[PDB]
Scaffold this active site. Structure first.
Site, short mmCIF file in Angstrom:
data_model
loop_
_atom_site.label_atom_id
_atom_site.label_comp_id
_atom_site.label_asym_id
_atom_site.label_seq_id
_atom_site.Cartn_x
_atom_site.Cartn_y
_atom_site.Cartn_z
N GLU A 88 0.88 -1.21 0.00
CA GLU A 88 0.00 0.00 0.00
C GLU A 88 0.90 1.24 0.00
O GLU A 88 1.80 1.28 0.78
CB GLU A 88 -0.94 0.08 1.20
CG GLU A 88 -2.00 1.20 0.98
CD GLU A 88 -3.03 1.39 2.10
OE1 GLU A 88 -3.09 0.55 2.97
OE2 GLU A 88 -3.90 2.29 2.06
N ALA A 119 1.13 -0.27 10.70
CA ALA A 119 0.67 -1.63 10.43
C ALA A 119 -0.12 -1.70 9.14
O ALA A 119 -0.49 -0.68 8.63
CB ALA A 119 -0.14 -2.13 11.58
N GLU A 156 -3.18 -3.92 6.78
CA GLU A 156 -4.30 -4.84 6.81
C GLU A 156 -4.34 -5.87 5.67
O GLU A 156 -5.43 -6.33 5.26
CB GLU A 156 -5.62 -4.05 6.78
CG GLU A 156 -5.98 -3.35 5.43
CD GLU A 156 -5.43 -1.91 5.28
OE1 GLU A 156 -4.47 -1.60 5.99
OE2 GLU A 156 -5.92 -1.06 4.47
N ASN A 157 -3.19 -6.34 5.21
CA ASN A 157 -3.20 -7.32 4.08
C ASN A 157 -4.11 -8.51 4.47
O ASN A 157 -4.05 -9.00 5.62
CB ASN A 157 -1.84 -7.83 3.78
CG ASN A 157 -0.77 -6.75 3.78
OD1 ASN A 157 -0.72 -5.93 2.88
ND2 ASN A 157 0.17 -6.84 4.75
N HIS A 172 -7.68 -1.60 14.65
CA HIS A 172 -7.72 -0.85 13.39
C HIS A 172 -7.50 -1.80 12.19
O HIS A 172 -8.33 -1.85 11.28
CB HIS A 172 -6.61 0.26 13.42
CG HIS A 172 -6.62 1.12 12.20
ND1 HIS A 172 -7.35 2.26 12.11
CD2 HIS A 172 -6.06 0.94 10.98
CE1 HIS A 172 -7.21 2.79 10.91
NE2 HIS A 172 -6.45 1.98 10.20
N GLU A 173 -6.42 -2.56 12.19
CA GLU A 173 -6.16 -3.43 11.04
C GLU A 173 -7.19 -4.53 10.95
O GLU A 173 -7.65 -4.85 9.87
CB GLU A 173 -4.78 -3.96 11.07
CG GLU A 173 -3.68 -2.94 11.30
CD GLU A 173 -3.66 -1.78 10.31
OE1 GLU A 173 -4.19 -1.96 9.20
OE2 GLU A 173 -3.13 -0.69 10.68
N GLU A 220 -10.01 4.81 5.54
CA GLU A 220 -9.32 5.29 6.70
C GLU A 220 -10.20 6.06 7.70
O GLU A 220 -10.04 5.87 8.90
CB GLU A 220 -8.05 6.07 6.36
CG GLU A 220 -6.98 5.26 5.59
CD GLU A 220 -6.63 3.96 6.27
OE1 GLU A 220 -6.96 3.87 7.47
OE2 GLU A 220 -6.11 3.04 5.60
#
Ligand code: MET
Ligand code: MET
Ligand code: MET
Ligand code: NA
Ligand code: NA
Ligand code: NA
Ligand code: NA
Ligand code: NA
Ligand code: NA
Ligand code: NA
Ligand SMILES: [Zn+2]
Length: 870
Positions: free
Chosen positions: A121, A262, A264-265, A297-298, A320
């Protein structure tokens, strides 16, 4: 100018000429040279003569085939492989080489210690192979990895393991498949040797999920809190949003070299180890709560980001703003909602508002972007979340949850826009959000002015509210917003006066939709003290002429905790401004007795929540103080904050010590009540440190030496640095000697070095570039030493001789070539030059002009420098 050959524009979005539906990757992994084979199934949607334009950066192309035919109709251009004369449906095969070990920018496939890991990203996948590197192209991935078994025993990618084997020459392979189509920014690969914490979670409908946290060998002792927080995240998303995890495995890998927090894959999150590793002797309460935030969050991105993704990068806030809102709600529901809200509001008023006045100002949905990594911002994230929170305020929870459900029902499996989200909210709630959408397209902070009148003859309270937004560097034209403006009116006994008009209840959220309007409330039986903009109901500056007694009255009687804190802030702000003006004349601090008394009352109030007391007793940071002024005097702000601290310490000495001793805890535990007590205790210690020196030195050194936890040790160490107590050097040397081989723990010590008020801080910081625990190749170390100096030591960074600016230029000259993303984060304090006096401004300008002349100036720095010098 908003005109640049290198800029991309939101209004130029068009659907792609080609889609990819499935991609099969093979990695022949080696740190010096990795061979990537990518087989994609593609489909032309555009005209038969439009060629396929694939993005690629620093790839060595080996071969190109179309349906197994070696292709001749192609060319390489800057950042692209352009393939002509394609059929309508075809298989594309690309073979290319890359070099992880030369990748110092940490974008694409790179090395973190002995591990190999990815960051894709926003536009990192193009550093791995030639692709349609744009998030409206979603495809099903299959990923095969081949590597040396001793060096890389774990080979991970998204989804589940579907195949595996052993080869000659000590190599092995694993293949992975993820059934959900994804944009390539969500691709991940990790290869390395790890300890693994394994656990399970059973979803609400009974799906069993394997949870696996991969950490460097030796770090398993610091993994359980992150695991627990993951489970908490999953449970909460189920309870609050009705959302469950959709795969069989959830993997998290903690890596030491990572530019952001971090990522989020899908099924394989990759985390900066800063947001994973904790134990009571290495991490503070705030670290534990940050780990919880980020883990959450992730995880929450799994729906708000992964199952529904972004049509293009200008829609970044779609994921986001919404995902930050979700991490805030999570933190708030599990912990102290008031303290969460207070800290988010401190960040908005003190850091976001400054960006929205800066040359880098942009709407939460930007219109123009040169380097997309520059738009991972306070505005996109924090202001984006305030915009979602406004929708929540307008709709209410039940309508907001209906909107979330319509959003997913429409857009699951696809890439969406901000506008699609707002439309789902509108259609599900029947609340009209047409005007509201202007919050997405207009930059800058609105200023809301309120005047009030009480008519005792009619018992009416009239509010006249006006708004405007000043022009920003990116936009000359502004219009009024739909501002939800929450109020509460208090009577002389501290009770809420019901709001009414013509003998009908009126909602407490006013719709401030015009440049100017008037609201008249009836049956206002006593002249009210108002709480205005309750819970920071919109991200605006308020102008209202508060008396000191209105404020102290709110501090004692307001119903919500946040407004008590908010009133305290408005009370201090007046005296912060007074005393900055006094500092410039060489005068001593002046504070009325009644202001000190208000803070005394909070310290001695037996019913107040200690978490709230502690926030009332935490002075605004130098960043929040800077918001108050048109021209910032960084030296006066730092000195005023210190003098105010000294003065309250003298005035409240006995009460501070008493509350300090009453909140002593013999046991350390990570629990919200215990955290609140400790935060109050340590807030008192901070003041005590600035009081009488002998007592200070004794309290602080003793807290440090007797601490059984990093929270209490660090609060003491920090106080010793900040007040320059006799024990300081010895405590600092002890911490170094104990913790030097632990980079995450050393980051705290670098930050304390960098933020020291001592006269020779720059000299000490420069010398720390050679410290045993510092390295220029690690973004965390850089941010902890250099970034903290520039960003959080405004008095030293802004030394009149310009020495701070030169130091930053030297660091940036290195980082511009090594890691542009970190360079761009670090340049931010120079681009604020127009907030400063003429002499500082001219030196900052010369620093910028010097960076503008770098050979091979990165796009990341160029975007910020040209805006700043314009
Ligand atoms: C582009 S890295 C940022 C990662 C992720 N989108 C986050 O919100 O933290
Ligand atoms: C805070 S209500 C009073 C408004 C105004 N000072 C008046 O006397 O009418
Ligand atoms: C911020 S502590 C002061 C500097 C410390 N004595 C050192 O030289 O490392
Ligand atoms: Na596709
Ligand atoms: Na995402
Ligand atoms: Na809570
Ligand atoms: Na705080
Ligand atoms: Na509408
Ligand atoms: Na008034
Ligand atoms: Na305030
Ligand atoms: Zn995010």
């Amino acid at each position: 100018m908003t005109q640049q050959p290198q800029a991309k524009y939101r209004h130029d979005y068009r659907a792609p000429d080609y889609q990819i539906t499935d991609i099969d990757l093979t990695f022949d992994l080696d740190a010096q040279k990795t061979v990537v084979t990518a087989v994609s199934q593609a489909v032309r949607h555009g005209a038969s003569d439009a060629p396929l334009r694939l993005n690629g950066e620093d790839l060595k192309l080996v071969s190109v085939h179309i349906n197994d035919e070696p292709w001749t109709a192609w060319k390489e251009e800057e950042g692209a492989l352009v393939i002509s004369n394609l059929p309508e449906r075809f298989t594309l095969k690309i073979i290319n080489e890359i070099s992880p070990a030369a990748n110092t920018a940490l974008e694409g496939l790179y090395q973190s210690g002995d591990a190999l890991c990815t960051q894709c990203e926003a536009e990192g996948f193009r550093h791995i192979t030639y692709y349609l590197d744009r998030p409206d192209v979603l495809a099903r991935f299959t990923t095969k990895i081949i590597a040396d078994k001793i060096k890389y025993p774990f080979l991970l990618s998204n989804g589940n393991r579907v195949a595996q084997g052993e080869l000659e020459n000590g190599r092995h392979w694993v293949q992975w498949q993820d059934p959900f189509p994804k944009p390539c920014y969500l691709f991940a690969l990790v290869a390395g040797d790890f300890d693994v914490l394994r656990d399970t979670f059973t979803t609400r409908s009974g799906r069993e999920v394997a949870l696996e946290l991969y950490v460097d060998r030796g770090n398993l002792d610091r993994a359980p809190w992150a695991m627990t927080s993951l489970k908490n995240s999953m449970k909460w998303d189920e309870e609050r949003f009705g959302l469950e995890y959709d795969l069989d495995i959830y993997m998290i890998v903690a890596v030491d070299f990572f530019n952001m927090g971090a990522m989020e894959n899908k099924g394989l999150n990759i985390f900066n180890s800063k947001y994973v590793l904790a134990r009571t002797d290495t991490a503070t309460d705030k670290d534990y709560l940050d780990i919880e935030r980020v883990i959450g969050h992730e995880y929450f991105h799994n729906w708000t980001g992964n199952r529904v993704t972004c049509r293009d990068w200008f829609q970044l806030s779609l994921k986001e703003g919404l995902t930050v809102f979700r991490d805030q709600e999570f933190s708030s529901d599990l912990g102290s909602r008031a303290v969460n809200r207070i800290n988010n509001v401190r960040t908005m008023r003190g850091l976001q508002f400054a960006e929205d006045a800066s040359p880098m100002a942009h709407p939460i949905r930007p219109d123009m972007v040169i380097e997309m990594n520059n738009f991972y911002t306070l505005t996109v994230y924090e202001k984006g979340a305030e915009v979602i929170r406004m929708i929540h305020t307008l709709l209410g929870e039940e309508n907001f949850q209906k909107g979330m459900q319509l959003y997913f029902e429409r857009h699951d499996g696809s890439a969406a826009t901000c506008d699609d989200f707002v439309q789902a909210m509108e259609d599900a709630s029947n609340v009209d959000l047409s005007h509201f959408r202007r919050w997405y397209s207009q930059s800058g902070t609105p200023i809301v002015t309120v005047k009030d009148d009480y008519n005792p003859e009619t018992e009416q309270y009239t509010l006249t509210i006006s708004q405007r937004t000043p022009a920003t560097p990116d936009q000359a034209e502004k219009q009024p917003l739909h501002i939800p403006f929450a109020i509460e009116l208090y009577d002389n006994e501290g009770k809420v006066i019901p709001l009414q008009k013509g003998g009908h209840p009126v909602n407490s959220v006013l719709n401030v939709t015009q440049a100017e309007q008037t609201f008249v409330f009836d049956n206002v039986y006593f002249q009210p003290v108002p709480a205005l903009l309750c819970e920071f109901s919109a991200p605006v500056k308020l102008e209202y002429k508060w008396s000191d007694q209105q404020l102290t009255f709110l501090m004692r009687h307001a119903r919500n905790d946040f407004s008590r804190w908010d009133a305290a802030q408005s009370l201090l702000a007046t005296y912060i401004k007074l005393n900055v003006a006094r500092h410039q004349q060489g005068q001593p601090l002046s504070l009325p007795v009644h202001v000190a008394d208000a803070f005394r009352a909070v310290l001695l109030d037996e019913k107040i929540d200690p978490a709230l007391a502690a926030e009332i007793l935490t002075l605004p940071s130098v960043n929040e103080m800077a918001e108050l002024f048109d021209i910032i005097d960084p030296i006066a702000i730092a000195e005023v904050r210190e003098a105010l601290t000294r003065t309250l310490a003298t005035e409240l000495a006995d009460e501070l010590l008493a509350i300090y001793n009453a909140n002593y805890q013999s046991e350390y535990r990570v629990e919200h009540e215990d955290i609140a007590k400790r935060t109050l205790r340590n807030a008192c210690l901070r003041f005590l440190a600035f009081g009488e020196t002998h007592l200070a030195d004794v309290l602080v050194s003793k807290q440090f030496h007797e601490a059984n936890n990093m929270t209490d040790a660090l609060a003491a160490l920090s106080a010793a640095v900040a007040a320059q107590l006799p024990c300081r050097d010895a405590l600092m040397q002890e911490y170094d000697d104990k913790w030097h081989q632990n980079g995450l723990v050393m980051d705290k010590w670098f930050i304390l070095q960098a933020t020291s008020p001592a006269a020779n801080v720059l000299e000490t910081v420069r010398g720390l570039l050679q410290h045993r625990s510092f390295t220029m190749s690690n973004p965390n170390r850089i941010r902890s030493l250099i970034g903290a100096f520039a960003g959080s030591n405004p008095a030293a960074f802004h030394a009149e001789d310009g020495s701070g600016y030169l130091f930053l230029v030297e660091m940036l000259t290195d980082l511009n070539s090594r890691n542009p993303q970190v360079a761009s984060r670090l340049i931010e304090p120079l681009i604020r030059l127009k907030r400063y006096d003429a002499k500082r401004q001219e030196k900052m300008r010369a620093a910028l002009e010097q960076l503008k002349g770098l050979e091979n100036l990165s796009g990341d720095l160029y975007e910020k420098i040209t805006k700043a010098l314009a």
